[PDB]
């Protein structure tokens, strides 16, 4: 009935979210970001071509997992210079089966919470990149186009030793239950 | 069986982007 359209909407949201998460957590210098209107609020999006392509490729590979409801979580993992996870924005996604301004509005909520989440988060070390983790089951065809293969996440990235938990937002509609929450280390 | 996966490539480094931003 709906389904494709949910994934479409969801995938685009995650794109916009990942950019904004990189801007507010200062993973790349603020100078690469330009202001864009998105869900009718001010957001920040990278102008750096290769970064933009990295993000697009990641999410275009996630899309088929979303499209047939195989994504348990999409985690933006922030990593320090030594490639150790300092911070994780976990988007945890369910699409239960079963029984449009409302979706925009509930997505806008997550965007807004990200914008101001600097007010509730311990500011990160210098020298940071990120990666994306996707919790799923056992896309091997968009990996092969793209030249953007995926590989099992290392145990150092999945486990965070004794993490602090900072929820930002929850939505619970009929179509979609999503909780966004951060994990920090001590 | 439940699995976590990641992109094999790393995102652009902060340094590489900084240089892009300079030049």
From Swiss-Prot, chain A:
Per the record's keyword annotation, is GTP-binding included, yes or no? no
Which taxonomic lineage does the organism of this UniProt entry have?
A: Eukaryota, Metazoa, Chordata, Craniata, Vertebrata
What are the boundaries of the region Mediates interaction with ipaB? 134-186
Q: Name one Pfam family in it.
A: HORMA
Task: Please give the superkingdom of this protein's source.
Answer: Eukaryota
Q: Which residues form the HORMA domain?
A: 4-182
KW Electron transport (keyword) present: no
Q: Where in the cell is it found?
A: Nucleus; Cytoplasm, Cytoskeleton, Spindle; Cytoplasm; Chromosome
Q: Which UniProt keywords apply?
A: Cell cycle, Cell division, Chromosome, Cytoplasm, Cytoskeleton, Disease variant, DNA damage, DNA repair, Fanconi anemia, Mitosis, Nucleus, Transcription, Transcription regulation
Identification of the protein by name = Mitotic spindle assembly checkpoint protein MAD2B
UniProtKB/Swiss-Prot annotation, chain B:
Q: Which cysteines are joined by disulfide bonds?
A: none
> Which tissue types show expression of this protein?
Ubiquitously expressed.
State where the protein is found: Nucleus
Which family does this protein fall into? Belongs to the DNA polymerase type-B family.
Domain commentary: Its C-terminal part could serve as the catalytic domain during nucleotide polymerization, while its N-terminal part could provide sites for protein-protein interactions with other factors during translesion DNA synthesis.
Q: Quaternary state and partners of this protein?
A: Heterodimer with MAD2L2. This dimer forms the minimal DNA polymerase zeta complex (Pol-zeta2), with REV3L bearing DNA polymerase catalytic activity, although its activity is very low in this context. Component of the tetrameric Pol-zeta complex (Pol-zeta4), which consists of REV3L, MAD2L2, POLD2 and POLD3; Pol-zeta4 is the fully active form of DNA polymerase zeta.
This molecule's function is given as:
Catalytic subunit of the DNA polymerase zeta complex, an error-prone polymerase specialized in translesion DNA synthesis (TLS). Lacks an intrinsic 3'-5' exonuclease activity and thus has no proofreading function.
Listed name of the protein: DNA polymerase zeta catalytic subunit
Instruction: Tell me which species this is from.
Output: Homo sapiens (Human)
Q: Which residues of the full protein are shown?
A: 1990 to 2012 of 3130
